[model samples]
Target: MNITDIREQFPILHQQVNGHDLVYLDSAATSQKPRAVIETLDKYYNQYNSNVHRGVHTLGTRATDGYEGAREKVRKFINAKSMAEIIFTKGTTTSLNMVALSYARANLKPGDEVVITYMEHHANIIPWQQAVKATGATLKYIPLQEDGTISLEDVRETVTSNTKIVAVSHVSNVLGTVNPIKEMAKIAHDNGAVIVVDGAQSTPHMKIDVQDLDCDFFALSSHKMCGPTGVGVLYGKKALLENMEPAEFGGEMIDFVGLYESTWKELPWKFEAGTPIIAGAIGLGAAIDFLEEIGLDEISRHEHKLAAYALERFRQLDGVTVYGPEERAGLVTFNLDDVHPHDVATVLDAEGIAVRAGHHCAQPLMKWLDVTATARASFYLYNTEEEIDKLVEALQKTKEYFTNV
Candidate 1:
């Protein structure tokens, strides 16, 4: 990938930090927005800033167009069946919470199991934990391989007819291992269980087809994919959604209001409770346009190469311990010997190198790794080998500085 062509699209990449050119490697936390996404949001408020699906006015029509239009874009982006299966959410956390409340709590019985892995983000983990607590259902975990990948044989052993829902990440946020969601979905369905895919990490880096994967439910965030924050998608199959209750109620989600009882709307609207995330959704739509222009397959190819290069570079350095399998996604999570990750991150920041250093919201996984925190360097389309070189040089300096001190 010729990064100059892509770097020009993101205004934030041109600036200097700490007297050095900014080397942003934090796309896993949230990707930097492109000009297309930013302008779409700017154009929305400047042109039509009105509530959606409520009025007969021109602004309302335009506002509704942009809002629901974003839904259609998301539907197409993930290759979902229709807009009915797509629900606008605050982000992946809200989307996963909806699945927990509307589906898991309502359907799971005392003996039923909701299976997930240790690799899921807190958004996918806590909601199920909470639901199982309320519904008396059992929350189970599929054990990960020592190499940080999941084995289908393990999946076969873990899931059974008693499993009601199996929540799994399509890509691990920390390990960078892509789980076999398609095979896992089949195992879930064969055993009369449903699979919920946490697509927050995958959707940004790869092409996802819900129909092909046959996943019962999927959740994704916009900000991680060159779009604005506060917008996301929850995709559920039509049959599953029809049977599930709305996660929240009131305003636009209602069909009729009565003193004693009220009815809700159909499909997606039923899940979107109040005034929708209009501008964020519009920006997400533009972000989809931006990604489509670049092509997801192209993005994937670029990132796989980038990740390989990073692994090659980091492995050469002493005291660097890289996690995850060699063939993995477009990020590397590692730690330097005898250096606190926070301290490493601070020194790198001083060198104008940005990397994530924390538990990364996966404490259970961190506990499994037997560390309080680790550092991560993520790549997006805009990132280059030059940036990786800067990171390596910065790391050498960081280690030397710490070693001498």
Candidate 2:
């Protein structure tokens, strides 16, 4: 992909931040939208902005098509079995919570177990915690290795016949550790348990085939993948989703309302209640189009190169402890000795470099790493090697500034 041509598509990258060129290294938090995605949202609002599924008016049909069309796009993007398996939610947090509230609560019993890992984001962790608490089921954690990656042996040992659900992240948002979702899925399946993957980070960088992974459920956010905010997807195996109860009630999801009884709609819509995020889903559809044109494999390769380059540059700086394994996704989490992460981020921000600082929504990971917080520089398809050099330079300045003070 042409870096210049690709960079030109993102309008936000052109401006200056704090009197310097904007170097966005915080894509792990949320991706900057491409012009195509923005234009799609604009077009939807300007032309056919109407409620979906109910009306037969011209604009209503257009809106319904746009909304349902986005679901088909997501189904193809992730290689889900069918459109019926995909349910749009607010984002990954909502998606995971749905699985916990609807699927886990119904299936799990007092003797059943729910397994997770230490590297899961809070979004992945808390819902299961609550699910287990409410059901009287046990919550177990699969131990992380020294490099912050999980072991298949640990997964096999932790997931037993009594384990009803295995919830884990496909990639660690804080450590940048890519987990072995497929292998873990096999282990969970062998133990008669279903695997649920938190794909919020991995889906943005890699080409996902949920069928190949054999994950029973997968959750991802749109905003993290150059799509609009407030829209995401939960992909469940058709049979599994067909059996789970809807997490929300009322409106769009209902088939008919009687005096004292009501029936819900079919598969995907049954999970999506109330007015959906129509414009946001349409924007996400456009974002999928943009990413596909560029190709996920190409993007993954570019980010891998960036990760290697950034890690090499980070090594030259003294007193900076980089976390995670040698090989990782396109992000680096590190801590500068004697400097708070927020201060480090502030110093970098003054130079027009945006990086994420703090627990990164992975408090369990921070406690596992023996630190309260850390700084992260996460790259995306639009990032360049020169930006890594800029970040490394800013980090050196941050260290020097803190050491002197």
Candidate 3:
């Protein structure tokens, strides 16, 4: 809907950064929290400040309901087959690590190949590397097209009988390349390989159906979508998760515990160890409500328009170099000619603009782009074209200041 109403909900966007008004374009890093999400966490900590799962007391029961209730919300958000498949972790990083450690290293034998692309974030990449070292499995990378996207032809070539697992990012964090996870998942299955889709960059901007995609596993972070940090989900198929051992042990995940041996609770609980992130999960549920009220399709349209406007605006700047494909999810990765990315970001910050300035945790992609680092102005639902104009204006000054001085 209403852009003004949506912007009003995020209190952080109103305040000044330096001498000017705040213009936050760093949503791909972490979205600004709405009042609804913030207040939900506040209510949880204030009212139901007790542990979940094992409590018969009122406050404990309330807390347990809130925690597990968030899991149901996550299950619906991705259209998972069942709640048993949804495992809450610290974030997407932890979720992927669980798959790598518990699934990849354990299931795949030596000389088996694991395929991914060069566009993956470090979160997606490093875990598979750990699998390679631990299992003696071969780590393979799919080649990116000229515009940073991958072609199905290459995917077919990359995944063969030797491939045991294929992990990929649904959308590139740096290049804004949205990979075809559904089609890729089909290929993985046809070749008898499991596919793990990283939904961290895609879920905040679009609707996701794990069943429809038929992926073996999926991972996402809550912080990138207006929820609290240190909370996320890993969704695996029931059969796969049932077969794999828990990555972390003790506390709530146990069914029968002995000093010498232990048995884990079935399905999702086995993967979730210790005290859960109760307040953060509750906040995530409220964030889900906020997004669902707006409609994901509407949010997608708004972000696409903002990204197109940003790309058009940035292309007009004389000394600017933009990265990624022409068609992208909700961001623009770019840098100023001659000015270092950190310098460009510093100048923009002085103008009260907040943009991400780094490799964006995708150093491999940085290498592919032939740059040490780059500046990114990632948009979300609340961003406006007027904000894009401000970014372009700041960049023009940034180039001029660097050249003249």
Candidate 4:
């Protein structure tokens, strides 16, 4: 892959930051938009800007086609069995909330257990907590290993006959741990439980097959994968989604309306309330095409190489503690000895190197790691090793600047 040429495709990467060249390594939070995705959005607004699925006009038909086309793209992206299984959402948080409110509320009984790992982002964690509270169920956590990964043995111990739901992240956003979700899903199924996977961090960095994983539901965000924000996906098994109620209720999702009662629409439409994010879905479809043209395996390999190089580069610096296993996705989460992550981020900003500094929405994991907060450098296919070198140099400068201060 010609990474230099690929990098050129992202116009945002060509600009300057704080009088220095931009070095964006925050793909885990959100990726820089490529020309294809940006242009698709521009084209949608420029040509066919109309509400989808309700109008018979040409512009409306075009809009509907574009919007639904994105759904098919997403279905194929994850290799979902059918388009009915995919529902447009605001993002992963909204998607997971749908499952928590719609599915969990209906199925869970008092004393039923909802299992999740400690490494989950708040999006995945909090929704289940809410479900537990609402249903009078218990929220149970799967124990983590010394390296921060969940073991099957732990899954065997934690999941029981009383377990109705098991939620976990496909990749740890903070720890950079690639979870054994397939094995964990098996355990959940053996216990007659459904598995919900938070694929926010996994979808962009690796290839995902929902069928192979055998998960009941998977949630992800479009913005993190080179698509527009405010659009995401919730893929549920058809039977499960069909049986579940819509968490949000409104016009687009209604089947037949009467003076007193109304019937809901089919599987996905029932879940997608209100006029959907047409432009955002169009942009996401373009992103899927963009990634597919480049190949997900190639992108994953590029990021893996970048991560390994970054790990070696960070090792040269003193007082830096890297977290997670050696086998990780294209991200490194670490902390500088005495400097707060926010302060470190501010210093790196002056050097024009962008890195994420916070608890990264995993406060429990932060407590487990014994840090107030940490900094993260995440890579995408467009990120070059040269950019990692710049980040390493800026990090060293941050250490020197803070020590002197």
Scored by lDDT, the top model is 2
Identify the superior model by lDDT, candidate 1 or candidate 2.
2
Model 3 local distance difference test score: 0.91
lDDT of 4 by residue, 1-405 (tens): 889888889999988999999888888889888999999999999999999996699999999999998999999999999999999999999999999999999998998999998888999999898889999999999888988888899899999999999999999988789999899888999999999999999999889999999999999999999999999999999999988888988899998999998999987799888888999999999999999999999998998899899899889998999998888999999989888888888888888888899999999888888788899988998898899988888888888888897
RMSD of 1: 1.0
State each model's CA lDDT, in order: 0.92, 0.93, 0.91, 0.92
Could you tell me which 10 consecutive residues in candidate 1 have the lowest summed lDDT?
1-10
Summarize candidate 1's per-residue lDDT along 311-372 as a digit string, tens digits.
Answer: 99998899999887888999999999999999989989888989999999999899888888
- For candidate 3, report its TM-score: 0.98
C-alpha RMSD values across all candidates: 1.0, 0.9, 0.9, 1.0
Which lDDT tens digits does candidate 3 get at residues 1-405? 889999999999999988899999999999989999999988988888898886789999999988888889988998998899999888899999999999998887887999999989999999999889888889999998888889999999999998999999998888888899999999998899999999999989999999899989999999999999999999999999999999998788998989799999987889888988888888888999899999999999998899888888887888888888988999999988889999989989999999989999999999998999999989998998889999999999888888898
Clashes found in each candidate (C-alpha, N, C closer than 3 A): 0, 0, 0, 0
Q: Which scores higher on lDDT, 3 or 4?
A: 4
The regions of model 4 sitting more than 4 angstroms off are none
Roughly what TM-score does model 2 have, to 2 decimal places?
0.99
